[PDB]
TrEMBL record, chain B:
<comment type="subunit">
    <text>Component of the large ribosomal subunit. May bind IPO9 with low affinity. Interacts with RBM3.</text>
</comment>
<dbReference type="GO" id="GO:0006412">
    <property type="term" value="P:translation"/>
</dbReference>
<comment type="similarity">
    <text>Belongs to the universal ribosomal protein uL4 family.</text>
</comment>
<dbReference type="GO" id="GO:0005840">
    <property type="term" value="C:ribosome"/>
</dbReference>
<protein>
    <recommendedName>
        <fullName>Large ribosomal subunit protein uL4</fullName>
    </recommendedName>
</protein>
<dbReference type="GO" id="GO:0003735">
    <property type="term" value="F:structural constituent of ribosome"/>
</dbReference>
<keyword id="KW-0687">Ribonucleoprotein</keyword>
<dbReference type="GO" id="GO:1990904">
    <property type="term" value="C:ribonucleoprotein complex"/>
</dbReference>
<comment type="function">
    <text>Component of the large ribosomal subunit. The ribosome is a large ribonucleoprotein complex responsible for the synthesis of proteins in the cell.</text>
</comment>
<keyword id="KW-0689">Ribosomal protein</keyword>
Amino acid sequence: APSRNGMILKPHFHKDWQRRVATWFNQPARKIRRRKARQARARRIAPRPASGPLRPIVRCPTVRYHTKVRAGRGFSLEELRVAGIHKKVARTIGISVDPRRRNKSTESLQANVQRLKEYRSKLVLFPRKPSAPKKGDSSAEELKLATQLTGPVMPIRN
Amino acid sequence: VSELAGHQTSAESWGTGRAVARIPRVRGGGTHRSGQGAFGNMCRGGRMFAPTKTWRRWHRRVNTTQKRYAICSALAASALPALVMSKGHRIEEVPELPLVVEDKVEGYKKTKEAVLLLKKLKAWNDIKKVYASQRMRAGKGKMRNRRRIQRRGPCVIYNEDNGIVKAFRNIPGITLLNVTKLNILKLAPGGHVGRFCIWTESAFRKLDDLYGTWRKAASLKSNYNLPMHKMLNTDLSRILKSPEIQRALRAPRKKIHRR
Amino acid sequence: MKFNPFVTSDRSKNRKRHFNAPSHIRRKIMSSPLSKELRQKYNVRSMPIRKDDEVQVVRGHYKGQQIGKVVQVYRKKYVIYIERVQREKANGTTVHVGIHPSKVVITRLKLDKDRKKILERKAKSRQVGKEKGK
RNA sequence: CGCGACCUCAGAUCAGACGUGGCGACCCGCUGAAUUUAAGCAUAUUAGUCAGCGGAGGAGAAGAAACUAACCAGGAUUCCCUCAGUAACGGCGAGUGAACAGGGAAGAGCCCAGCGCCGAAUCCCCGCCCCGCGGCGGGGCGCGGGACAUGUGGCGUACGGAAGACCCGCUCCCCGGCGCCGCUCGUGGGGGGCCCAAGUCCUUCUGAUCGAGGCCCAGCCCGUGGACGGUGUGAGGCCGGUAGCGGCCCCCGGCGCGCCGGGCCCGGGUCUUCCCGGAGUCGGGUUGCUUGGGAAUGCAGCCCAAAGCGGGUGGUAAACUCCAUCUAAGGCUAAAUACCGGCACGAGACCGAUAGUCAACAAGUACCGUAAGGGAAAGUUGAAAAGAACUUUGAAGAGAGAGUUCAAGAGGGCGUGAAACCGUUAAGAGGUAAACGGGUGGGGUCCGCGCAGUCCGCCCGGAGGAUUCAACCCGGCGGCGCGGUCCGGCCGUGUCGGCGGCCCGGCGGAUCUCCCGCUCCCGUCGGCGGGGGACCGUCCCCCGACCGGCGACCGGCCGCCGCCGGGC
RNA sequence: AACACGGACCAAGGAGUCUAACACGUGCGCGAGUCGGGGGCUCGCACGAAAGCCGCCGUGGCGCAAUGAAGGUGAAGGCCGGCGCGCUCGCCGGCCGAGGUGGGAUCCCGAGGCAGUCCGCCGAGGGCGCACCACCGGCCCGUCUCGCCCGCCGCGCCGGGGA
RNA sequence: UGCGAGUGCCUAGUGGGCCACUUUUGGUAAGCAGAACUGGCGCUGCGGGAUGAACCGAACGCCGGGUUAAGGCGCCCGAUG
RNA sequence: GCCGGCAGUCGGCAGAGCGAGAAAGAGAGUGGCGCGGACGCUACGCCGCGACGAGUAGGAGGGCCGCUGCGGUGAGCCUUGAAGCCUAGGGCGCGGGCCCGGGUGGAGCCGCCGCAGGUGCAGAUCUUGGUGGUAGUAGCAAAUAUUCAAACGAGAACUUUGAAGGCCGAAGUGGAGAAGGGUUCCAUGUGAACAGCAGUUGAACAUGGGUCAGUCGGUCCUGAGAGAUGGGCGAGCGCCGUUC
RNA sequence: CGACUCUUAGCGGUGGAUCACUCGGCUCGUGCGUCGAUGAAGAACGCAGCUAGCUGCGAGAAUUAAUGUGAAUUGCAGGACACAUUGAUCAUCGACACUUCGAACGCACUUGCGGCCCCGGGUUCCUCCCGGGGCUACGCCUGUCUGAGCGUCGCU
């Protein structure tokens, strides 16, 4: 029974919504549960970054946005073949690899290659044995770095 | 209250034609609770009116500028000793209300010297007042894990955790506030701005690095500056007594004119 | 206050644990402080009451300077009996009115080989806090 | 007329295993309404919800595109926000109602059939030996059996792969046992057991103190311990605990190191030659259900029913043509997610015995109905039973005494004991039922501890007493000061100057331009990014002036006045 | 008052609550901006399942722009001088820069008076005119009518402009 | 002639009425049904009409004095005893 | 409602006023002894005039009206007596209600500033529980009937014994079973509660005891029928059917 | 004065309201997240010196064994223990045991009937009889054994 100028409201309360009320009192406990597992995740991988593998430079679809640069699913194989890293070695070294990503442009390809090229420069690959095999790292590069990288590795600057 | 309370029974009302008055009653049985009355707020047992649900609006969110507004007024009311005594704190022997001490207080580890520190600052009388105010809580709160109540004492604001929390821990009334984690619920208990505060040397120099002055930014918060005063000359006894205002006033009419 | 989150600190829960404690916990709750002279000889603050200790009465109607032996320990009602602490009934019989172990100071323990091993281990733990807390 | 293989189908108390049922808060697969709304009602809505059925797990499901998009393109699945109460559906009424993208939590990819190549190179079971065997495994020996060519195992799955020629520098991982060192972050992974500080000090009130006062620095001692509970009240120190990067003793686990017995000698790039797709399935017609999906979103029954530069999709049906994106009809996969059941806990601005779960107690008990099912009422003596010994009346229930307890004015349904109602005593009244309002009068119980009746200041008179008044001296404290304009510090949400701190200062800028890194081209020339460098706005040092203030923000003399103490 | 209904009495319990959507009014903070939702970071959570912080500080919601069913479009003109027909039209440079009328709380000047200067105060009359109301104008989008002009990479079933 | 005026938001309750001077419809008439203006009850107590919806007077915070309206002044019952 | 008034308590740093018919100042200049003065102003406060005071549904405002709990606050109260309850005591406020005095009681409780609600009862043929009038009233009347003496006991109309008189009249008020009941069967003791009076009594209570099978039944067989396996159906728990 | 009736007050009765307590519920949060043919859940029946109900337990029946702890349980008796001894009581519990029905499992629920082996009384197996123990349900997988077929074939 509307009276004197209200909006024609359509509340979606005609179902038995009281049986399916989702309370959010778990929010502070869920935040501690996620955080205490996040610190525990970072302590199992001692020298590895806490955020995980490297994400590529990715531009938005949906011309509404059309200019923002996101963190992608993974580096495509066409981007990996230019940089000279095999697709089954990039997963183990800490590079996100997906096979679905196409590469229609060219400037975006070199953006992802240059991201991967200078990533190998700052990467500290530990040897599998304590006696370092070929193409590892020198012992002088080890001792001045015993910390991870909080936040995403190489944060993407728009 | 549980939604099954007052609904585990299976009762429907006897129809019209009997001396009872249309109440959902228990069906049969050689029992005391048989044809008595349920499913109503008026009956013994049964459901309460408007049962309290879990999804009531328990939490209230306040704007960050408003939350930062009250803490600026709470810290500014820690000065002006007329405010502190109006709260009830014993300040008469304190040499100076903005008590700033060295950073050696951070390095203390035992409560014996923490008690001795407050006596040499002549602030022990507040704790002495707190001790005499320890009594049983009035009401039903004693059987709900709220047996004892007491006056709150001098809060100590520390900048670095080095054992100052470990010292001012058993002495009643003292609450430790981090400089970066100051709380409005302890800087102004009960909604009253008066609170006697203890500051260290590192804590006291960080106040103009947390908020700044009016001509400088916060420099530790992103976008904040001190709010503008609505009026500067708050003492109106001097404004009304200013010669440039008395010149413009007319002659008063103070003769009383009765019937 | 308590900082371990697994501690009861509840009005209903602490009384439920106290009144419904089993017999071997009830031995520990019913502990009595030693006399002053034994406290510098054993370095032990308190010790559970035993069957054949003798007791100086601290408080109550039977408070005084008499030293009397424990007759028997009644762990269901959380109380012990003393030889010279009793009360005559109406019919002339005597009934031992009990005294709670918290109002009991022990002048000398009834020693056995399972008791000497408790005096030293409480005294050994006493000296750990003195050396560590020095 | 038989024997011997093979295929189909039986019997086993054959040898060895497997499933049933229950719980079911969360989940999956079905089946599945009517109350209600639309002010009626039939589509709609309730609602794919209640009920019914089956199935597991600690999570399940889903899950690595026959995807979204039309963009300079994103890229498994799951959850939150937002899109959004939007597109859309709807007797276009009530109402119903998504999805893309973006920001986040988490983030891990893979394996088959086929195509092929390897001498079935494979797997299961029985006997013997060695090891350990309380989640029956590893190695060896057996013309010891069986499965398997109606296809096991290795390489190998759309991201191409395989086989040959040729270039690059090559040889660590896994499994089953054994032992050893680091207690292995919430401060030592987990579980269990035992312990760790300080008043029962003096006096006093009480039945009992945990009450009150005091204890050399506000008091006695501890406080990395002042939470709680018990103790005859109200306990930091009487006790258990509490706090602690505290201590001691067992049991279990993973990560590291070494030994034994095995398996495995498995790469990438270039060139050449080959191969590569899952059928009663997609799709179409029709029907029914569902969906926002609307000329049919999705799921099913029937009929038709394929192709390989093919097929699916590109939110309006159809025909033609360019494109864009995937590869369906096979399968596995933790994490972010839910959890009113159970185990063990913690907490409460929650209720406090007609409340809170039906159930604080021998509660799903007593009891009711043949049954499905329905289903209560019921907490409190006392600090301690010290539960009333004993005398007398009565057969006894019941009393009078006596006795205990501070209290029975707490006497076994006993913490206090209200009202309705009743018994008895004191007073008063009574034939217009009783009761009430206004106004008085009378009579009572108590109150004013009333019953020669309140004081407060100035002055006058005579009777008495101080180590005393004014004015001076010294010391201290305080106020004021236009001291017309004393000297010196401090501050300014006021400025000037040095534009000095510029480097012996940081921040921000959509203000400009020696070094480093990258690709393109022939040590050089052009591009991109970053770091210096200059500029601007804003915070700091120096001198002086000016302005304001110390009256939200002062130091020493000086001048005046007031107060106190001591001399007179 | 009823020959209308309920009420023998007493004790306890007993009925406009909560969530969401809103509209208006009010208080506060910021302000053409506002907000921290959600998430993450500090200290183990006693109090703390609190607080503080964020090139996440704006992803996003609301608002700053509306009008059309949609393809789409989208909120200012005037003065002065010159070039072609004074053709109220097209093209070049400076100025005002967001209209006007009426009513408008306040404030300014203010004749005079409370030999002769300054501080106020009142003052006939004259004004720029807050907010707000009414009206006339002006501008944007959809639509109707009357017509001409301009431009090109593609001269057209092109696009734009006027009243 | 008298009165300080204008204007904008939300907004409960109401949507069964009745009576009376006068005008008046149907009906023989009605304490009947149905209309117009105005005033009342509803929502309102008080004095009076013995009693009382609407009749006359008069509208109300708690009181003292005085004076009245309508009604009244043999007694009930104040007042012509 | 008043363009209401009151910051003026401007004191040897002083001169104590602006109720008064008339638009504006108890305004600055320059030439001719005795240390003195009542209240105040929670400016959400104080004070002065004028008018008015009804009220249903309804709306608004103030509550130093009240209940419960929470953050502060009263160096708050309390076993030399808290809450609760009673009161022919003293009172306050228009009122919601509140403060003391006495008695019982024995362990927690109250005021102020804000916060929050499961916050105020006379009714709802309201719910639960308790108690009245009725009222010592209706009633203890279906089936012919009891009387005398003795015993036990404290107690006899109801128990037992003896005698008398009766009734059921063999389709019984008898002697035995089936179904059902489950210790009710028997002895002793009690008379607290039940046997609508009583009871020395009972099917009430407390102690104990008591049911013995080759031949008596069940057990075995099958009837009406029920119900698996095979088979079929069903999304499904499962359903159909008893020779298909 | 009476008897009866009304109001108030004191005291004594019916009644258990109010108040203060609370080994209890409700809500939220955390960890784990585990049933069963080696017999689950549930149910029945028994078990203490005196034991009705609750709880616990299963003919080893108020608990057995072991570890930890260490002088009690208790309402009343009793008796173990020396606490100078694995030792009273408690908790943990990892060894043993766990009656009947119940998915319930030899056939059906009357607790009645069966069969196949082994052992001891009968007996010195020679058949009855008795007692004890192990088996005997359905569905289904691998393998073994014995089979069936005018199924397809060869040998004859």
